[PDB]
Design an enzyme around this catalytic site. Sequence first.
Site, PDB file in Angstrom:
ATOM      1  N   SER A  76     -26.059   7.746  13.311  1.00 19.64           N
ATOM      2  CA  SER A  76     -27.405   7.538  12.763  1.00 19.64           C
ATOM      3  C   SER A  76     -27.269   7.334  11.255  1.00 19.64           C
ATOM      4  O   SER A  76     -26.464   6.497  10.823  1.00 19.64           O
ATOM      5  CB  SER A  76     -28.311   8.697  13.180  1.00 19.64           C
ATOM      6  OG  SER A  76     -29.675   8.295  13.140  1.00 19.64           O
ATOM      7  N   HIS A 226     -30.448   7.963  21.708  1.00 18.95           N
ATOM      8  CA  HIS A 226     -29.957   7.974  20.334  1.00 18.95           C
ATOM      9  C   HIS A 226     -28.847   8.990  20.104  1.00 18.95           C
ATOM     10  O   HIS A 226     -28.212   8.944  19.046  1.00 18.95           O
ATOM     11  CB  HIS A 226     -31.092   8.259  19.333  1.00 18.95           C
ATOM     12  CG  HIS A 226     -30.727   7.946  17.903  1.00 18.95           C
ATOM     13  ND1 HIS A 226     -30.399   6.675  17.478  1.00 18.95           N
ATOM     14  CD2 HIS A 226     -30.628   8.740  16.809  1.00 18.95           C
ATOM     15  CE1 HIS A 226     -30.119   6.696  16.186  1.00 18.95           C
ATOM     16  NE2 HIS A 226     -30.248   7.939  15.755  1.00 18.95           N
TER      17      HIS A 226
END
Length: 248
Positions: A76, A226
């Site tokens: 991320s 994610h």
Amino acid sequence: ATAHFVLVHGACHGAWIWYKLKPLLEAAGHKVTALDLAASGIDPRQIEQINTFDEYSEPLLTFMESLPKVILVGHSFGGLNIALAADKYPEKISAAVFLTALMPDTEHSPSYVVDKFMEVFPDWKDTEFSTYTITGMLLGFKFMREKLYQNCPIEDYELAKMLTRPGSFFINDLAQRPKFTEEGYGSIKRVYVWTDEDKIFPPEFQLWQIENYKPDKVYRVQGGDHMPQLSKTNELAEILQEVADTYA
Ligand code: NA
């Protein structure tokens, strides 16, 4: 072939997000370092004390300097931290793996792919924002449950609720600082690992970053949300083994 992996979390998270991937990689004989960045995890600093992206990155930069080559894995927003470490210590990096990450380039300001993420118009739901003398964010429970962890076991979402902390993208810092250099960040091998069920970095946005700065290798994690190190840990370990085999 075995490697030394250095695992770098994103904003609002900590080393704990690697708690299942780290022993799994160590079981294959790899060395693994999982860092807390400043004001992250159980680091004692608070985010209001971190004034620049360099300060936020300090634990990674300190670790890189103290190395006796590693494979960096940035998740991320951690993609920006590993790009910075690579701009500083390219000779210490066998490869940089961008795991559903913000992958910067050298042609634009470091803020470029964060601004492009904002262009995706993400739905922050119950996330809370504030300012300090930088904008900070505390990720909402529902935001994390639906946008980040939705393919994770329920207990991993419980860890997120117990351990996530205030974080920042340091957008102004990234926008004004020098571009990452072709001699440093631009010199190293890069791998992008994208997930096809990511609900916060849309797959099309991950693919845009890949096309914008072509890496040496690209892997898809089928069914990854994610948080693929939590939802797809076994699959991710196999991909990282191939990366070690390729670049060691
Ligand atoms: Na820790």
